[PDB]
Structure formats: structure tokens, C-alpha cells
Ligand binder design. Structure first.
Ligand SMILES: CCCCCCCC/C=C/CCCCCCCC(=O)OC[C@H](COP(=O)(O)OCCN)OC(=O)CCCCCCC/C=C/CCCCCCCC
Ligand SMILES: CCCCCCCC/C=C/CCCCCCCC(=O)OC[C@H](COP(=O)(O)OCCN)OC(=O)CCCCCCC/C=C/CCCCCCCC
Ligand SMILES: CCCCCCCC/C=C/CCCCCCCC(=O)OC[C@H](COP(=O)(O)OCCN)OC(=O)CCCCCCC/C=C/CCCCCCCC
Ligand SMILES: *C/C=C(C)/C=C/C=C(C)/C=C/C1=C(C)CCCC1(C)C
Ligand SMILES: *C/C=C(C)/C=C/C=C(C)/C=C/C1=C(C)CCCC1(C)C
Ligand SMILES: *C/C=C(C)/C=C/C=C(C)/C=C/C1=C(C)CCCC1(C)C
Lengths: 284, 284, 284
């Protein structure tokens, strides 16, 4: 696209940039391949667990089939895998893939477009494991945050005269994210405290460690994406391009693969009375 | 974009128009600022009410947290605020924002793209207050109507040879809107009549006035948007550009801020028996 | 859009192609008109049935109003009609409509963009009639399949150097589709077998034929779209353009109009005990 006052051509958000040669080196391609392989493996494992998923009483034939919330995390991984497959194709075809082409929600040819479909699922699943209140609201807040990030990317990659708008959108996102983060942490802490005071002088003591570790670590590890934005060329620029791709791949692996594996481990050790305690949690 | 048979350049739906200088005067900018401020204030107030929301029995700790339908209206305002924030940034950066750039659902850089995410929420919330039937169906109809409006905008702002298609889409939308409007009015009337015959010789007589006023006024006041389309330059052209922005800001304020404030007022006076009557309404 | 190394201009995904003259002959226009008329008729009939829809006990006033799953199929037809109306306008205005213009989910100006909104509804409705498990999961799989098809279309209609990516995406879609197809067939078979062993020595024997025919035929007839893709110019090229439009119109008619009519016929003959059997089906 052309801009007034200059002859420079800007390829962001246009089909012209879709046909440009790729700007990535071998490191980014290797990171994309590794993330795709890991996501495929985790998707297959979660699908296998969902198929052979007896209930907490180990009596229901298809427990995840009738109560599909247990499949929610699986969905994330599956869609995440899709969001990487296209990337892989790009590195095989040698054409540009960064912030060019059509805007499709759930497809990661834009920086935060793929997260806009899976992040609410992640927040809902994390809050649902403790039967916490304010599940859909946090998902809506996260959806708005990712929309703000997408607009920040559009403003950052465009005409220089409209560069400060990127910072403005980033600030908006950060403000609301801080609010949501604090709320989520408080809610999680309260819920876990109640669970700890419900399981006193009672078994299932080992599974509580796994649940606590998973929920707390994978709720606190969401600060990585704003820090990456701060250090990427859109911010300070401490790490150049082709290294923010590796950082995003590592963040996606930690946020999705490890979280799904932790939930799979937790669902393999809990039993009826802990399920009843979890049900009692969401009653007050 | 270029068009056959002419050298004229059309900037609708392109990234070229995203970098163009703004066409708005100070009045439209002031209207955008006022609407953003009002939406921010209402979002904060609704969030505060949702946090300190005891149930109708005034016993539940987090009533809106576990039954999140009460938060629905809040969501609208929040997203509406987002849809204006970007607009604000545009007026600060001095670049064009009308029907240019990427197409993101829920972002108001296109005329009716932002309404496509919040209008079904508004219809569902309005029909849910009376426990009325046909809630999701009306939301789907409204979603289709806003899609028709978006396509009408695309046809209107494009090549002149394809201008009549705008009118065609407008007609489609109007037809279905008339159908939905009649259906909604009938349903609301019937439900309120039943409520009036359920609360006879019973208290809670003051809150019925507030509920009736809110539901009836904010269901009838949806005719304003087709009239604005009729009088805007896309239709007759009685009011020029930079004044349809003020009209849309006023319509958004009335449809969202006042509706949320009215529901907040209603939820502050009703009690257990009116809640039981509302539950009895959705049983037949 | 321009591509490096050549002066050829590619109109896919651009606003430039929106203003180009139409490439369709009279046969494609007639097929579009026939499909639009059929979808309009079925939408009106399904709306009439939904309005005058007594329950299985023939006692509830608005059965579909309070339990809106019965309206789900109707929604499909309605949206399908919208997806054709715009097409009709294009043939009246004489401008290009194939894979050009804005990308709107649910609007069929791209090949598989309209199916991405109605196909999950179709899968959920088909699996819900037997109270089968894994309803939302199959809908998500189908949504991913249609996204893969859309990306395949983008790669196929673009620069020749990036043509093999179309095949790659097609393969991805086919793989996952095969998985989903097998799963769906197995589930349906098991559910129907249980229903057959629940209605033994019991009436409602005529409605079982209609249910079996509808579910089995309209689950098996989903293989037509991959075969059309295989034989269309994007694949082997056995049938040229302007004949894949007729094939897609016929496939849409069979998949939506006939399915809705079959469900309407089935809902006109079943009664209380078959409803209780259907409820018993989803319990194990
Ligand atoms: C603006 C965007 C905000 C996004 C906020 C939402 C974030 C995502 C929320 C995910 C919600 C859960 C998705 C899966 C639904 C599964 C629910 C379910 O199976 O149970 C519900 C219910 C109760 O069954 P039980 O009694 O447990 O059965 C036991 C008897 N054998 O049964 C049903 O399945 C009824 C259907 C309810 C769900 C209907 C489908 C809703 C789908 C919504 C979209 C989900 C994806 C959201 C993606 C967002 C991308 C922007
Ligand atoms: C083609 C688009 C058509 C759009 C049609 C839909 C319009 C919007 C409809 C909004 C539906 C309501 C959204 C909020 C869901 C909250 C429901 C809820 O909290 O209760 C449901 C249920 C029952 O709980 P109770 O028994 O009341 O709890 C008491 C025990 N302590 O609990 C649950 O939350 C289960 C989850 C159900 C909801 C799952 C999430 C669904 C989200 C769908 C998308 C919503 C946004 C739609 C935006 C549309 C934009 C195009
Ligand atoms: C990533 C995309 C994956 C898509 C997966 C989802 C595929 C579509 C699933 C469709 C789910 C059903 C849609 C219609 C919801 C209607 C449910 C309903 O009416 O009952 C639910 C419930 C129970 O009522 P009963 O007790 O039966 O009432 C009897 C008392 N008189 O009541 C409610 O309506 C509560 C609200 C629940 C539904 C909330 C709305 C959810 C809308 C989700 C989006 C649907 C469209 C999806 C389009 C997908 C396009 C990508
Ligand atoms: C699997 C992916 C996950 C969990 C992604 C999470 C992403 C965020 C929490 C992103 C946050 C952002 C901001 C707070 C500010 C603006 C930009 C973002 C998108 C990096
Ligand atoms: C907060 C915003 C609200 C409630 C918006 C409501 C908008 C409408 C009812 C719009 C209707 C339209 C038509 C009936 C015809 C075609 C164009 C529209 C979009 C103006
Ligand atoms: C009403 C429309 C319906 C039921 C459409 C169904 C479409 C499919 C099952 C399409 C499948 C595809 C693949 C399996 C591979 C890639 C391309 C598609 C989109 C043709």
C-alpha cells in the first residue's frame, strides 16, 4: 500500500506481501518445526486420553464424550497445531508469512490472530478446574486483550507517521491485562484455600500437589508474552527479529503442551471424593 | 483499488486508505470522545456492581460470578468502549478510519462491524429479563441484519457501477428486521401481560414500572439505526457526513449506556418474590 | 497484487478483483437462482413449523421457543439463503464474486467461508437427533476442515510458485476429515443399534425408518465436497469452471434442503415414548 508524502511501499495487511520472499533464517524455521511436532504429539496424546477416558468413578464408558469440558484443552492444542501447520508450509514454499495476506481468526499468519481463538479456551479451562467464578468474563477480557495486541501489530508494522498508535494499543492491553491478572490470581488463591480447608484429615493428598502446581504455574506464566512484546523490535528492540519467533514458540510450548500434559497427569490420579470436593467448591 | 473503465482510485476495503488523512472535523472528534468517556464510565460502574452483587435474596457472595448472564450487559459496554478507543487513537493520529484497513469482527473501523459482536448480546439480555422465548433466534436474526448492513456499506462506498447493490442489501436487512421487530414486540408484550397478571394483589409494584419502561423503551428505540441509514448520504443525504457520526454516537449512548443504567437501577429494588415470578414466567 | 519476478497481476484476495467483470455464464447464474429459491422456500417452511411447534406430547405452546435446539437446522437454511443472496446480486450487477473482496465469515464470496458458520450447526444437529456423544468436538473438527479448505483455495488461486501449498492444505483437511468421518459413522451406528434394541416389541416403528434414512444418508453424503474438489480445476480438472458452481449448488441443496425437510417429516410422526427412548439413549 502507498502512503501520502512518500514513495515507500508498505506490505502489511496486503496481498502483495503474501508473495514476497521469506525473511526468516534457519533458526526460526527449526523453531516452527519443533513447535509443530510437539503440538502434534500432544494433540494425539490428548485425543487418545479423551477416547479412553473413564470417569472419576471409573464406570462411565465415554466420560469426555457426554461432558465435553474435559476435551476443552485438547481443542486448544489441536487448533494450535493448525496455526503452526500453515507456518510450516510457508517455510517450505519460501514466501512471506508475517502479518501479510488475509485476516482469518484462528489462523496465525498474523501475530496474535491465532491466540484469539484458543486463549479464552485456556482461561476457561484453567478456571474450571477449580470451579472458580468469573469464567466467561475472564475469557472475554483476554479476547479483548488479544484484539488490542493485533491492532498494535497493525499500527507497528505500518506507516511510521502512525507508529505511536501501536504503543497506545499496547498500553490499553497492558492495563486491562493487569486488571484481569490480579482478579484471576485472587480468585484462584481463594478457591485453592477453600479446597485445602476441605481436604483436611482426608486422602487424595498427592493429587492436590499436581493441581496446585499446574494451576499456579500456568496462571503466573502468562506474563511472558507482554515481556516478549517489550523486548521485541516493536518495543525496546533488545532481541532482533528471527529470535522473537523462537521466544514465541517456546512460550506456546510451555503454555499449551506442558499445561495439557499436567492436566492429563492430574486426571490420572484423582478419584470420587476429590471430584465431590471440587463440586462442593462451586457452591459457597 | 483500481476499477475497469476508469482511472479513479477507490480506497474502500484497502490498506491504502488506512494511511490517508482524516476527513472528520472537530464535531465528530468531540462526539467520539464523549461517547468513549460515557462508555468507560458505564463500564466501570457495571463492573463495580457486578463485583458487589448480592443475589435477590441478598445472601449469595458472588451472585454474578456463578450465574454470569447478569454480566452480559456489562460485556456489551466493555466491548463498545474498545470499539471507540481505536477511533479515538485515529483522531489523535490524524489518519483515515472510515471503512478502511483490516476487517476485524468486533472492531469498529467498519461501520457495523462492531455491532456484530454486541447486538446479539443486547437482544439476548433484553429477552432474558422477562424469561421470554426465542432468545438465540432473535440474536441470529440481528447478526444477519448487521452482516447485511456491512455488505451494504461495502457496496455503497465502492465503484459507482455497483452502487445499487447497497440498496439491495439494505432492503434485505430491512425486511428481516421488520419481521424480527414485530416478533420481539409481540413476545415482550405477552410476557409482560403475564407478569402483570401474576403480580396482582402483590407487592413489588414499583420495580414493575422500571422493568416495563426499560424493556419497552429500549426495544422500541432500535428503529433509529435504519432511519439514520435512510437520512445519511448512503440514502437520501439529508444530513451530510461528519453529522452521521454524531447521530451514531448518540444512538450508541442511548442504546447501551442508558440500557445498562436502567438494568442497574432495576436490579437494586427487586427481591425474592419478583424473582420467583420471573422464574414462573418461563414455564407456561 | 504484484508478485516478484513477473509482471502478472493476481486478483485473489484483493479489492481490485471485486470490480472485475463476472466470469460466469448463464448456467451458473441459473444454478445460483435455483439454489436461492429452494433455500428461501425451505427457510420459510422451517420457520412456519417452528412457530406452530407443539411438543412431542402436543401440549407445550412454543416448544421450539424454549428449547431452541429444534431451531438449529432452520438457522442453517436461513444463513445459507443469505450466502446465496449476495451471489444473486453479483450476477445481477455483472461484477466478479469469486474469491475477491473482503473476507467475512459466514458470507460466501469465498468458496468455503460460508460453510464455516453453518457446517458445525449441521454436525451438531445431526449428532443431537440420536443424543450421540462428541457433538462439539466434531463441530470443531469440521470448522478446522473448512478453514483448511479456505487456505487451500487461497493457495490455489494465487501465484503459481505457491501452488503446491494448496495440495498440502487439501491433504491436511482430507486426513482430518477421514478421521472425523470414521468416528461419526461409528458413533451413529452404535447409537442407532441401541435405539433398535430399545424399541423392540414397541410401537413408533414407522418413525424409526425416517430417522434411520435421514441420519445415515445425510451423514454419508458428506463425501461429495472432497470429490468435487478432486474433480474441479483445483484438482484433476475433469470438469471446467462454471460447472463446479452447479455441482456445489446441487450439493448444498441436498445437504441442507433435503436434510431440513427430512427432519421436518420426522418431527411430524414421533410421540412421547420415542422421545423418552431418545432421552434414555444419552445416558448409558
Ligand atoms: C467474545 C468471545 C468470548 C468467549 C467466551 C467463551 C470462552 C470459551 C467457553 C467454552 C465453553 C465450553 C465449550 C464446550 C461446551 C461443552 C459443554 C457441555 O458439554 O456441557 C454443557 C451441557 C450440560 O451437559 P451435562 O449435563 O454436563 O451432560 C451430562 C449428561 N450426560 O450440555 C451441552 O453440551 C449443551 C450445549 C452447551 C454448549 C453449546 C456450545 C457452546 C459453544 C460456544 C463456543 C465455544 C468456543 C468459543 C471460542 C471463542 C473464540 C472467540
Ligand atoms: C451466529 C451468532 C449467534 C449468536 C447467538 C448467541 C448470542 C449471545 C448469547 C449469550 C449466551 C450467554 C453468554 C454467557 C453464558 C453464561 C451462562 C451461565 O453462566 O450459565 C450457564 C450454565 C448454568 O449455570 P447455572 O446452573 O446458572 O449456575 C448456578 C450454579 N452456581 O453454566 C455455565 O456457565 C456453562 C457454560 C455455558 C456457556 C458457555 C459459553 C458460551 C459462550 C457463547 C458465546 C457468547 C458470546 C456470543 C457473541 C456472539 C458474537 C457473534
Ligand atoms: C470453534 C467453533 C466450534 C463450534 C462448536 C459449536 C457448534 C454449534 C453448537 C450449537 C449449540 C446450540 C446452539 C443453540 C443453543 C440453544 C440451547 C438451548 O436453548 O438450551 C440450552 C439451555 C437449557 O435450556 P432447557 O433447560 O432446555 O429449557 C427448557 C426450560 N423451558 O438454555 C439456554 O438457552 C441457555 C443458553 C445456552 C446457549 C447459549 C448460546 C450459545 C451460542 C453458541 C454459538 C452458537 C452458534 C455457533 C456457530 C459457530 C460458527 C463458527
Ligand atoms: C497459548 C497462548 C497464550 C496463553 C497467549 C497469551 C497471550 C497474552 C496474555 C498476551 C498479552 C498481550 C498484552 C497484555 C498486551 C498487548 C499485546 C499482547 C498480545 C502480547
Ligand atoms: C448498540 C447498537 C445497536 C443496538 C445497534 C442496532 C442496529 C440495528 C438494529 C441496525 C439495523 C440495520 C438495518 C435494519 C438495515 C441495514 C443497515 C442497519 C445495519 C443500519
Ligand atoms: C452445507 C455444506 C456442507 C455440509 C459442507 C460440507 C463440506 C465438507 C465436508 C468439506 C470438506 C473439504 C475437505 C475434506 C478437504 C478440503 C476442502 C473441503 C473444504 C472441500
Amino acid at each position: 500500500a502507498h502512503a501520502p508524502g512518500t514513495d515507500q511501499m508498505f506490505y502489511v495487511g496486503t496481498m502483495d506481501g503474501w508473495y514476497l520472499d521469506t525473511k526468516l533464517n534457519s533458526v526460526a524455521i527449526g523453531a516452527h518445526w519443533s513447535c509443530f511436532i510437539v503440538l502434534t504429539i500432544t494433540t494425539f496424546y490428548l485425543g487418545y486420553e479423551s477416547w479412553t477416558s473413564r470417569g472419576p468413578s471409573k464406570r462411565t464408558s465415554f466420560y469426555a464424550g457426554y461432558q465435553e469440558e474435559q476435551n476443552l484443552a485438547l481443542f486448544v492444542n489441536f487448533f494450535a497445531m493448525l496455526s503452526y501447520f500453515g507456518k510450516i508450509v510457508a517455510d517450505t514454499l519460501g514466501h512471506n508469512f508475517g502479518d501479510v495476506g488475509p485476516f482469518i481468526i484462528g489462523f496465525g499468519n498474523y501475530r496474535y490472530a491465532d491466540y484469539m481463538l484458543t486463549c479464552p479456551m485456556l482461561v476457561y479451562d484453567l478456571l474450571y478446574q477449580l470451579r472458580a467464578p468469573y469464567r466467561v468474563s475472564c475469557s472475554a477480557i483476554i479476547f479483548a486483550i488479544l484484539m488490542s495486541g493485533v491492532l498494535a501489530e497493525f499500527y507497528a508494522e505500518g506507516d511510521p507517521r502512525l507508529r505511536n498508535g501501536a504503543y497506545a494499543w499496547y498500553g490499553f492491553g497492558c492495563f486491562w491485562f493487569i486488571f484481569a491478572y490480579s482478579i484471576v490470581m485472587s480468585i484462584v488463591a481463594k478457591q485453592y484455600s477453600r479446597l485445602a480447608q476441605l481436604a483436611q484429615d482426608t486422602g487424595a493428598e498427592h493429587s492436590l500437589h499436581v493441581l496446585k502446581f499446574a494451576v499456579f504455574t500456568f496462571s503466573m506464566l502468562w506474563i511472558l508474552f507482554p515481556l516478549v512484546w517489550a523486548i521485541c523490535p516493536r518495543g525496546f528492540g533488545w532481541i532482533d527479529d528471527n529470535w522473537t519467533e523462537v521466544a514465541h514458540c517456546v512460550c506456546d510450548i510451555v503454555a499449551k503442551s506442558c499445561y495439557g500434559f499436567a492436566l492429563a497427569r492430574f486426571r490420572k490420579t484423582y478419584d470420587e471424593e476429590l471430584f465431590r470436593l471440587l463440586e462442593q467448591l462451586g457452591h459457597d
